[PDB]
Structure formats: structure tokens, C-alpha cells
Write a protein that binds this ligand. Structure first.
Ligand SMILES: [Cl-]
Ligand SMILES: [Cl-]
Ligand SMILES: [Cl-]
Ligand SMILES: [Cl-]
Ligand SMILES: [Cl-]
Ligand SMILES: [Cl-]
Ligand SMILES: [Cl-]
Ligand SMILES: [Cl-]
Ligand SMILES: [Cl-]
Ligand SMILES: [Cl-]
Ligand SMILES: [Cl-]
Ligand SMILES: [Cl-]
Ligand SMILES: [Cl-]
Ligand SMILES: [Cl-]
Ligand SMILES: [Cl-]
Ligand SMILES: [Cl-]
Ligand code: NA
Ligand SMILES: [Zn+2]
Ligand SMILES: [Zn+2]
Length: 432
């Protein structure tokens, strides 16, 4: 029986059908050596074009021969897939319109929920599955770091056979993105393939932000600056990220994408202005610095070289007022407990069940030189506290926007929510 070396057993993602994005079932490998599941072969090849959906090679003769002999399936590959992914196969076992656009887009959306990529998010704007909104954060290794960029995705009716149309809604200073948000990227036009996904497109866009292609520009002036005055390009990129993409300008740490994600949990249909987001970022940075500094002193005074979740917990009690401290302590403890009792995951935040960045918080705790060593639980606890406080502030700020007949949180709604809440005013009144 066909067996593979263990190192060469294909992953689940490598066993997906390039057309429907479901697991390959009864895989049909065409003479061009491109594969698709039998339902997709029946719907897109046998019934209609009689051509390979990937390379357009004709396969009518091949199909005639092997349909008569019931030898369309690649039994060697089918054996391997059934052996290593039997449950995924079982869910497709009892079935005969595979390959349709609506099904493919829905499958990609479901896949995103199970496996989000690199702090990106994408989903339907309303009830039209063919129109999506996407959110990407500016890569850390780029002058867009800390920014939140919104994009629109328009799926064509014959997706995945034609590429999706992706454009920036947020203004950005980039040689390959113009004032309308049009993107010059190979994956969107010349190098599109039905097996590519929105996830891979967003990852490719993030990589473009890290490393532009100045030799094929949409804005020649920006490419010229990138090629002759990189410092000026970086400076202007950072400035635009602050002006339009909720950046910090590069001086302070940005949490805008995490604030936004928390906001969508407590108030899905409510937005936040850039000025208000700058205030939210000032709170998080100040709370971080107050807790981290207190924990630094608690480790030193007690002759401990490490800041652990115990110093974080004590610092929270010392710095926050009663009920806020009690809930924060409960949230940080819950996150450290969940983190310790969970498997290593894609991100430490996911292992802790948090939106805020555990890994980044840990890096900041070490970069600030608050102590010689920082335990793994400290950033989990601290990130959970910052997330809880952000959630409590956005909860009240959103309630102030609803009461004011507004759908967008602005500084007025934040200053109102904080002043009206006794404990929050005591915690943040001086920061404002
Ligand atoms: Cl095997
Ligand atoms: Cl082996
Ligand atoms: Cl079978
Ligand atoms: Cl042929
Ligand atoms: Cl067959
Ligand atoms: Cl399985
Ligand atoms: Cl920079
Ligand atoms: Cl332009
Ligand atoms: Cl466009
Ligand atoms: Cl130009
Ligand atoms: Cl304590
Ligand atoms: Cl991580
Ligand atoms: Cl980092
Ligand atoms: Cl680190
Ligand atoms: Cl860093
Ligand atoms: Cl720890
Ligand atoms: Na971050
Ligand atoms: Zn398929
Ligand atoms: Zn082919």
C-alpha cells in the first residue's frame, strides 16, 4: 500500500481543493498534473469546458477514456488523504454544485474564523457575501507600524476564476498604492490563481507594505523618494500613518488595532474617530507604564530579579481603585490560568484568550528595562488588564454615543464617560 515518508505527509491545507477550498475527495489529477476534487471536476470540467481550470489544457480525450473505465481518481493520492484526514473526508462522504462562487467565498470566511492571519480580519460588510471589508495592521518592520488600514474587497461573480478587487480605503503613502487606494501587486492580476485566497492576498499586501516595489510604481514621485531618500520616505510614511491610519507617529506604542477589535466586541455597530483613538492609546500607554513601574519597584524592594504575574497583581491592587482592581485581578488571573492550561498556539494571545498582544507586551516589559528578567505570566496578566480596562471604557463611551444619537465615538464621549464614572475618573482623570 502506497505509504510516504513521515516528513512528506501532506498537511491538511495542502490537501484542499484549489477550486472549492474543501478537502480533496476522490481527487482527480488531470494529465497536466493539476488536481481537483471529483465534485469540482464534474461541475467545472466534465459538464462544461472540458479544460483544466488551472492551466486551460483540454482533457476531453482523457476524460472520455477514464470515465468509461471509472479511472478518473488518483487512487494513490486518495489513499493518502483518507489515511491521514479521515474525519474531514467523512464529512464530505455523503454528497454528489461544487465550485460555485458563493460556496467558495463562504468557505474562505469559515476558514478565516478558524485560522486568522497575522492580526488581519476580513468579512462581509452587510448581507452581500460578495462585498467584504478588510482590516490590516501596519507591519512592525515598516514605517506603517501601529497603523490600522481598512480595505474593500469585491468578489466577481465567477470567483475564484477571476481575481478579487482589493483597494485601500485608508489613505497611505506608498509607491505602489495611489490616492484612490488602487494596489499594484502581482497576486491581484498577473499572478492570480484559483487556489489563492483572501488570506494570502492580505499577507501579500502586508509584505508589500514592508518592501515596496519602486521599479513598478503607481506614484512615480514616491518611488523616486524611496529610491533616493529612504529617510524622507519613512518619515512621510509615518506621518501619514498617524494622520490617516490611527498611528502614533513613531514616538509611542500604538494599540489601535486592539482597541478597535475590543470595540467591535462591546459595540459591533459603533465606530471610533481618530482623535478618540489617540486618547484610548494614551490611556493604555499610561496604565502600562504605571503598572510596569510599580512592578519594577516591587521586585527591587523585595530583592527579586524577576517581574512575575505576582508583582503585576500587587501593582494592579496598589494602582487601581477597589472594584476596578477586583475585576482586573480576576481577569488577569483567569488569563494566566487559561494560558498555563492550554497548548502552545499560533500566538500567545490566542493561548491566553486575549485580543491584546501578549508577545508585544512581553517585549515592551523587557525593552523598558524594568527588571533583569520578565516571567512568561507577567505579560499575559498585564495584557489582560489593559484589555479589561479598554473594554470598560469603550462600553461607557459607546453608551454616551448612543445617548447622543451618534454612531461614532469622539473625544466628547470619552471625556464624558470617564468623568461620570467615579472609579475611571480616579484612575484616568490626571492623564487627560
Ligand atoms: Cl503515508
Ligand atoms: Cl519515515
Ligand atoms: Cl472512495
Ligand atoms: Cl483532448
Ligand atoms: Cl471514476
Ligand atoms: Cl481528519
Ligand atoms: Cl520608520
Ligand atoms: Cl496618486
Ligand atoms: Cl482599484
Ligand atoms: Cl508622481
Ligand atoms: Cl496580591
Ligand atoms: Cl505570540
Ligand atoms: Cl514584538
Ligand atoms: Cl521579548
Ligand atoms: Cl521592539
Ligand atoms: Cl510570571
Ligand atoms: Na502590536
Ligand atoms: Zn473542489
Ligand atoms: Zn492543468
Amino acid at each position: 500500500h502506497m505509504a510516504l515518508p513521515k516528513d512528506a505527509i501532506p498537511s491538511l491545507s495542502e490537501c484542499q481543493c484549489g477550486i472549492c477550498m474543501e478537502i480533496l475527495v476522490e481527487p482527480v489529477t488531470l494529465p497536466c498534473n493539476h488536481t481537483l476534487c471529483k465534485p469540482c471536476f464534474q461541475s467545472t470540467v466534465e459538464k462544461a469546458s472540458l479544460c483544466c481550470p488551472f492551466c486551460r489544457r483540454r482533457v476531453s480525450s482523457w476524460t472520455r477514456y477514464h470515465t468509461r473505465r471509472n479511472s478518473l481518481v488518483n487512487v494513490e493520492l486518495w489513499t493518502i488523504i483518507q489515511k491521514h484526514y479521515p474525519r474531514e473526508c467523512k464529512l464530505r462522504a455523503s454528497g454528489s454544485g461544487s465550485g460555485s462562487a458563493l460556496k467558495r467565498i463562504n468557505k474562505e470566511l469559515s476558514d478565516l474564523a478558524r485560522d486568522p492571519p497575522a492580526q488581519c480580519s476580513a468579512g462581509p460588510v452587510g448581507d452581500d457575501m460578495f462585498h467584504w471589508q478588510a482590516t490590516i495592521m501596519g507591519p512592525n518592520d515598516s514605517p506603517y507600524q501601529g497603523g490600522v488600514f481598512f480595505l474593500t474587497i469585491h468578489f466577481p461573480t465567477d470567483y475564484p476564476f477571476k481575481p478579487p478587487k482589493v483597494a485601500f480605503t485608508t489613505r497611505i503613502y506608498h509607491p505602489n498604492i495611489n490616492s484612490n487606494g488602487s494596489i499594484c501587486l502581482d497576486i491581484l492580476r498577473s499572478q492570480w490563481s484559483p487556489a489563492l485566497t483572501i488570506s494570502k492576498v492580505l499577507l501579500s499586501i502586508c509584505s508589500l507594505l514592508c518592501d515596496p516595489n519602486p521599479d513598478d510604481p503607481l506614484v512615480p514621485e514616491i518611488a523616486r523618494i524611496y529610491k533616493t531618500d529612504r529617510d524622507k520616505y519613512n518619515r512621510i510614511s509615518r506621518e501619514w500613518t498617524q494622520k490617516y491610519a490611527m498611528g502614533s507617529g513613531g514616538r509611542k506604542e500604538s494599540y489601535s488595532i486592539y482597541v478597535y477589535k475590543v470595540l467591535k466586541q462591546v459595540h459591533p455597530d459603533t465606530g471610533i474617530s481618530s482623535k478618540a483613538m489617540g486618547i484610548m492609546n494614551s490611556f493604555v500607554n499610561d496604565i502600562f507604564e504605571r503598572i510596569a513601574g510599580e512592578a519594577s519597584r516591587l521586585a527591587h524592594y523585595n530583592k527579586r530579579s524577576t517581574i512575575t504575574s505576582r508583582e503585576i497583581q500587587t501593582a494592579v491592587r496598589l494602582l487601581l481603585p477597589g472594584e476596578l482592581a477586583k475585576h482586573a485581578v480576576s481577569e488577569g488571573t483567569k488569563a494566566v490560568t487559561k494560558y498555563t492550561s492550554s497548548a502552545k498556539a499560533k500566538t500567545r494571545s490566542s493561548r491566553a484568550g486575549l485580543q491584546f498582544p501578549v508577545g508585544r507586551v512581553h517585549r515592551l516589559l523587557r525593552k523598558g528595562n524594568y527588571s533583569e528578567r520578565v516571567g512568561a505570566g507577567a505579560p499575559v496578566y498585564l495584557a489582560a488588564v489593559l484589555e479589561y480596562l479598554t473594554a470598560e471604557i469603550l462600553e461607557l463611551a459607546g453608551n454616551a454615543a448612543r445617548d447622543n444619537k451618534k454612531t461614532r465615538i469622539i473625544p466628547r464621549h470619552l471625556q464624558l464617560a470617564i468623568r461620570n464614572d467615579e472609579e475611571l475618573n480616579k484612575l484616568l482623570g490626571r492623564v487627560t
